[PDB]
Design an enzyme around this catalytic site. Structure first.
Site, short mmCIF file in Angstrom:
data_model
loop_
_atom_site.label_atom_id
_atom_site.label_comp_id
_atom_site.label_asym_id
_atom_site.label_seq_id
_atom_site.Cartn_x
_atom_site.Cartn_y
_atom_site.Cartn_z
N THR A 63 -0.49 5.38 0.89
CA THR A 63 -0.80 5.32 1.98
C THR A 63 0.46 4.97 3.31
O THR A 63 -0.27 3.70 3.76
CB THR A 63 -2.07 5.98 2.13
N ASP B 150 -3.89 -3.79 6.44
CA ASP B 150 -4.20 -2.47 8.42
C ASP B 150 -4.91 -3.06 8.18
O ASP B 150 -5.87 -3.48 9.69
CB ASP B 150 -3.87 -2.02 8.04
N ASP C 89 1.30 -1.34 0.61
CA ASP C 89 0.19 0.30 -0.67
C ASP C 89 0.77 1.62 0.01
O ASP C 89 2.09 1.11 0.19
CB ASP C 89 -1.07 0.06 1.17
N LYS D 88 -7.72 -7.47 -4.10
CA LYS D 88 -5.42 -7.96 -3.93
C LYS D 88 -5.35 -9.43 -3.64
O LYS D 88 -5.42 -10.54 -3.70
CB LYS D 88 -5.32 -7.64 -2.28
N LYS E 299 -16.97 18.86 0.98
CA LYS E 299 -15.93 18.87 0.70
C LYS E 299 -15.77 17.66 0.36
O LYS E 299 -16.51 17.20 1.43
CB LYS E 299 -15.25 19.45 1.46
N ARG F 161 -2.63 15.19 -3.93
CA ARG F 161 -4.04 14.43 -3.83
C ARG F 161 -5.44 16.18 -3.57
O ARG F 161 -5.27 16.74 -2.63
CB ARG F 161 -4.30 13.91 -2.41
N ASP G 12 -8.15 -6.68 4.48
CA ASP G 12 -7.37 -6.98 4.35
C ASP G 12 -7.16 -8.53 5.25
O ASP G 12 -6.38 -9.12 4.03
CB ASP G 12 -6.04 -6.38 4.34
N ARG H 283 -19.72 6.95 -0.88
CA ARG H 283 -19.19 6.62 -2.14
C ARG H 283 -19.87 6.79 -3.58
O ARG H 283 -18.97 7.15 -4.26
CB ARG H 283 -18.42 4.87 -2.43
#
Ligand SMILES: C/C=C(/C)C(=O)O[C@H]1C(C)=C2[C@H]([C@@H]1OC(=O)CCCCCCC)[C@@](C)(OC(C)=O)C[C@H](OC(=O)CCC)[C@@]1(O)[C@H]2OC(=O)[C@@]1(C)O
Ligand SMILES: CCCCCCCCCCO[C@@H]1O[C@H](CO)[C@@H](O[C@H]2O[C@H](CO)[C@@H](O)[C@H](O)[C@H]2O)[C@H](O)[C@H]1O
Ligand SMILES: CCCCCCCCCCO[C@@H]1O[C@H](CO)[C@@H](O[C@H]2O[C@H](CO)[C@@H](O)[C@H](O)[C@H]2O)[C@H](O)[C@H]1O
Ligand code: NA
Length: 1000
Positions: free
Chosen positions: A359, A709, A357, A690, A521, A566, A713, A495
């Site tokens: 980040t 994490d 990953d 993944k 935002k 970003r 996952d 989303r």
């Protein structure tokens, strides 16, 4: 801990009563004094011991003593059955069982110690991965993570999805819409259960009825909650159910499979040599059929087989492997690579692909707004923006806004005023000044905290901050903005729209004429479509195509630029609907509420890569290890980051090496598999991708390290050969992984791979060393039996050599320094055999020389020795006829053939050759002329210890009388050296052959 019960019936009490019982404020938490007193009173939050170490050694000792006594009774039955009519030689049958008893005792001792050593090595893993928890205490306003054992009754604890519940907790507040908990480890329930905060009246209710309690050991399936610790330690519901034993790890490591294959083949070889000894003596087929010839001729073959069994087995190897793994594990944990399972070490060196990953692993997750723009001028088709820069990469409110590298005041631009207002109101996070570290830390998400810090830097309302303390400075301007616009409520992220908003009403203070406002935002892709207007300072114009294209062009430039930003779009509904019109129980309608927006500006924040990532990527390149980035950024930014950190070249075409989740799903199956073998970049990826990537990578027989994490996952971490969980991440991911990154750093993955390679290399070294020693011992036994010579070595000396003399140098070879090309070679194949091909011939020559040298020194003593007799070769081979056919061998006593001096010569030659071969085992190919012996000091120390023990059992009077040895003089030691040192030259010649002629 004296009081082992703490608070009773916490489920029966209310939240108020539970907070009152321990006298703790829910706002602050426990004070340091309260923590000290509670820790002193209730003890640490942990369970004692392992399973039962205080009464475990006795069990194994008594069990192996039973296994010894049963074999003793069986051998006694055999020898008593050999008494009816068998009465030829009862004198020789009196020495063998004593030796066999000693062998059984020795093997029992080592079989107990090696098992206990392995158990302690496995248990030491847990010390490197301490369970953590999150508490609120009076010394800090933000949540702090501590060790679970340091949690005490009365602590205010926070739990979120994926966390492991650290103690028995009475739920105080459920921050999420619902709290679902997986209580399978306790109640055995299948699906997650729903929790609440209301009291449960029944004092003796079952655990399933305690719907307001979180039990230690369980996992949060969904949601976030705050609670107060009721009980810890043994008083925990799971501490009462201490009687629980899970299945063992099982799954044999490839090394263990190869070792057991060696064991089976060695059994076959022992049988083969036991038959070959009979094959050499054809004359035994010409003896009479009746009498005691066959019996006494079979007793000899039932003894040399045992001697050969002792010579063939490397008894001390498992202890050396265990010690090497345990010490390498401790080293790796010192380097932040927390291994959760010993086998993973072996697998770490075979790593061919690392899927990381972005980040937090490739970057630092220390976000900061470094660029931002608003609308300057709009004239039909022409659109001009006011771009700005911001200094300061940390969360501290230190920095200024720059326009064309020149400082300006943010309050001059009404657009920037609205920018800061949006960033302050659409923000659940804040800043907390850690006075101990003297730094500003985040309270919430890195993104929203970067927004807060930006608002503090901008100071659009011009507030005095030079006379404020570090604590008052952290959230000053944000509080100013909160004083004006009162947040009515929050439309949460979703989303389908990629944005969030807040409905705010202006406070009745010279700003009520503005009316209610919604501040939005989100990601530009989601927000820009829903903007019908564009704010220009304080005015508003209609949003058109050219303006939209200008905005998108600048966002694209920032995303693909050197900073790879970003961007976040900021907008506001000027005329929002009424509170009665909006419904908040279903987010599907929120996108409708956030329509007819006015675009205000865009903030560009960076998440810098770790400064070691480029070098580690290069190291993976040299090691033949592919690295695949998985990020949440858009495809363009993802590729820009891949070029920035070196995954991609700065000019190479990557149309078929970078994919998004949607693009990857649009390809057919065969094309998906074919894309996994070349892709290095995956953007906007669903959680199932993944697992699919791991399956496709396995289809090409690759060993994959996959990072994770979160809870989603866990499946992929389970499928991957090396699941790698983040140290700050959830417990669900950690339990499903093979390794944890204590620092969440990609370089730690690389270091773990390198260390696994080095450790397996050193294991190969000492394995080949010990097994070549056993080869030499077997060759000695067979060469002695074939030439009919006396026993040059007895099995007791063989046990002492395999366990003590060679055990120290092998353990020291466990500490060999890694080769300079450890990371410049392709990944090891997991099916790679340890000894085969040229190495087979090499170590066969080594072992043959060992056996020949031992037997030849034993023979040299009998002949060309001043202290020895003038015996020749023809009579030394017929020494068993000395007592009978005396005129053929007239000269001295026949008992001189049972002398301890030739055995001492042979044993000294063996020990010296083994020290020399240990020196040769520092490298597989490099000669001793290139890599000196003094690089592994532990090897020198171990050789000194081995030789000291040899001199001890040779000279210190009580010991050679037990080992059946006799001290030597300078001439005999010089002979030992002259016949032992050439093994270095032999292995040096083999190494020169391997280097200058066998590179292909
Ligand atoms: C210990 C004493 C030796 C004699 C022994 O039995 O080991 C053999 C045998 C079991 C193998 C051989 C040994 O074979 C011989 O040395 C041939 C002996 C013929 C001599 C007769 C001539 C008069 C190993 C030892 O050869 C030497 C030359 O290195 C290498 C390797 O062993 C390993 O790789 C170790 C794995 C833990 C194994 O081929 C192994 O079998 C396979 O399963 C492996 C993969 O194990
Ligand atoms: C009836 C006879 C029984 C009584 C024996 C009398 C005591 C003998 C003195 C030697 O003591 C042994 O020393 C070994 C090394 O110094 C140890 O091996 C240990 O260390 C080796 C290498 O360090 C490993 O290979 C072995 O597996 C591991 O047992 C072993 O434990 C220990 O007992
Ligand atoms: C901490 C609080 C301080 C931060 C607040 C930031 C200040 C900006 C708020 C803007 O409010 C809107 O501004 C529009 C103009 O920009 C107005 O449109 C008015 O003016 C437009 C043209 O200027 C017309 O097109 C519209 O019809 C007319 O409603 C609109 O009514 C008004 O609600
Ligand atoms: Na796994």
């Amino acid at each position: 801990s004296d009081n082992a019960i703490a608070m009773e019936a916490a489920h029966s009490k209310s939240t108020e009563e539970c907070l009152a019982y321990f006298g703790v404020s829910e706002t602050t938490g426990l004070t340091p004094d309260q923590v000290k007193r509670h820790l002193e009173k209730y003890g640490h939050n942990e369970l004692p011991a392992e399973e039962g170490k205080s009464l475990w050694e006795l069990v194994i000792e008594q069990f192996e003593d039973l296994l010894v006594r049963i074999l003793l009774l069986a051998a006694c039955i055999s020898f008593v059955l050999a008494w009816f009519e068998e009465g030829e030689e009862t004198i020789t049958a009196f020495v063998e069982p004593f030796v066999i008893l000693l062998i059984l005792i020795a093997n029992a001792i080592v079989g107990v110690w090696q098992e206990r050593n392995a158990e302690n090595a496995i248990e030491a893993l847990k010390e490197y991965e301490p369970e953590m928890g999150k508490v609120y205490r009076a010394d800090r306003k933000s949540v702090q993570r501590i060790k679970a054992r340091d949690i005490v009754p009365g602590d205010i604890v926070e739990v979120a999805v994926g966390d492991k519940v650290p103690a028995d907790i009475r739920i105080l507040s459920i921050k999420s819409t619902t709290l679902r908990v997986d209580q399978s480890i306790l109640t055995g329930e299948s699906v997650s259960v729903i929790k609440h905060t209301e009291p449960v009246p029944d004092p003796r209710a079952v655990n399933q009825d305690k719907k307001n309690m979180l039990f230690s050991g369980t996992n949060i399936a969904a949601g976030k909650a705050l609670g107060i610790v009721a009980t810890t330690g043994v008083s925990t519901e799971i501490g009462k159910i201490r009687d629980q034993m899970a299945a063992t790890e099982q799954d044999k490591t490839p090394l263990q499979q190869k070792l057991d294959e060696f064991g089976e083949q060695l059994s076959k070889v022992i049988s083969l040599i036991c038959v070959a000894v009979w094959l050499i003596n054809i004359g035994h087929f010409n003896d009479p059929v009746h009498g005691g010839s066959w019996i006494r001729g079979a007793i000899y073959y039932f003894k040399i087989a045992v001697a050969l069994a002792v010579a063939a087995i490397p008894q001390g190897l498992p202890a050396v492997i265990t010690t090497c793994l345990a010490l390498g594990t401790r080293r790796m944990a010192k380097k932040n690579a927390i291994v959760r399972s010993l086998p993973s070490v072996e697998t770490l060196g075979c790593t061919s692909v690392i899927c990381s990953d972005k980040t937090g692993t490739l970057t630092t997750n220390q976000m900061s707004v470094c660029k931002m723009f608003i609308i300057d001028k709009v004239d039909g088709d022409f659109c001009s923006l006011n771009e700005f820069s911001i200094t300061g990469s940390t969360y501290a409110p230190e920095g200024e806004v720059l326009k064309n590298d020149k400082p300006i005041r943010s309050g001059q631009f009404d657009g920037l005023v609205e920018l800061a207002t949006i960033c302050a109101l659409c923000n659940d996070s804040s800043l907390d000044f850690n006075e101990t570290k003297g730094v500003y830390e985040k309270v919430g998400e890195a993104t929203e905290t970067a927004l807060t810090t930006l608002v503090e830097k901008m100071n659009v309302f011009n507030t005095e901050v030079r006379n404020l303390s570090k604590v008052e400075r952290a959230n000053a301007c944000n509080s100013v903005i909160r004083q004006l616009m009162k947040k009515e409520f929050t439309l949460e992220f979703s989303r389908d729209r990629k944005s969030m908003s807040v409905y705010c009403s202006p406070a009745k203070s010279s700003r009520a004429a503005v009316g209610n406002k919604m501040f939005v935002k989100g990601a530009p892709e989601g927000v820009i479509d829903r903007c019908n207007y564009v704010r220009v300072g304080t005015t508003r114009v209609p949003m058109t195509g050219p303006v939209k294209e200008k905005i998108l062009s600048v966002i694209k430039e920032w995303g693909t630029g050197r900073d790879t930003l970003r961007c976040l779009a900021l907008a506001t509904r000027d005329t929002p609907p009424k509170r009665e019109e909006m419904v908040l129980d279903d987010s599907s309608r929120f996108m409708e509420y956030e329509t007819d927006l006015t675009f205000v500006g865009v903030v560009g924040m960076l998440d810098p890569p770790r400064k070691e990532v480029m070098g580690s990527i290069q190291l993976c390149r040299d090691a033949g290890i592919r690295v695949i980035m998985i990020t949440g950024d858009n495809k363009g930014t993802a590729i820009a980051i891949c070029r920035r950190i070196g995954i991609f070249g700065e000019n190479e075409e990557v149309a078929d090496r970078a994919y998004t989740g949607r693009e990857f799903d649009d390809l057919p199956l065969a094309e998906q598999r074919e894309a996994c073998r070349r892709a290095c970049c995956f953007a906007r990826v669903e959680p199932s991708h993944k697992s699919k990537i791991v399956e496709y990578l396995q289809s090409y027989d690759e060993i994959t390290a996959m990072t994770g994490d979160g809870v989603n996952d866990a499946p992929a971490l389970k499928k991957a050969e090396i699941g790698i969980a983040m140290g700050s991440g959830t417990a669900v991911a950690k339990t499903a992984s093979e390794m944890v990154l204590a620092d969440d750093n990609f370089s730690t993955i690389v270091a773990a791979v390198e260390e696994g390679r080095a450790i397996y290399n050193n294991m190969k070294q000492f394995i080949r060393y010990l097994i070549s020693s056993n080869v030499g011992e077997v060759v000695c036994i067979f060469l002695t039996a074939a030439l009919g010579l006396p026993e040059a070595l007895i099995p007791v000396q063989l046990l002492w050599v395999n366990l003590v003399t060679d055990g120290l140098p092998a353990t020291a070879l466990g500490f060999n320094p890694p080769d300079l090309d450890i990371m410049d070679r392709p990944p090891r194949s997991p099916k790679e055999p340890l000894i085969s091909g040229w190495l087979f011939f090499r170590y066969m020559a080594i072992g043959g020389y060992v056996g020949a040298a031992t037997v030849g020194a034993a023979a040299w003593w009998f002949m060309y020795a001043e202290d020895g007799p003038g015996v020749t070769y023809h009579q030394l081979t017929h020494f068993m006829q000395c007592t009978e056919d005396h005129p053929h061998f007239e000269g001295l006593d026949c008992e001189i053939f049972e002398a301890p001096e030739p055995m001492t010569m042979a044993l000294s030659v063996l020990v010296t050759i083994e020290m020399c071969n240990a020196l040769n085992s520092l490298s597989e190919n490099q000669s001793l002329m290139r890599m000196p012996p003094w690089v592994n000091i532990w090897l020198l120390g171990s050789i000194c210890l081995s030789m000291s023990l040899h001199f001890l059992i040779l000279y210190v009077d009580p010991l050679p009388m037990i080992f059946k040895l006799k001290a030597l003089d300078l001439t005999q030691w010089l002979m030992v050296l002259k016949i032992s040192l050439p093994v270095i030259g032999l292995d040096e010649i083999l190494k020169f052959i391997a280097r200058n002629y066998l590179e292909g």
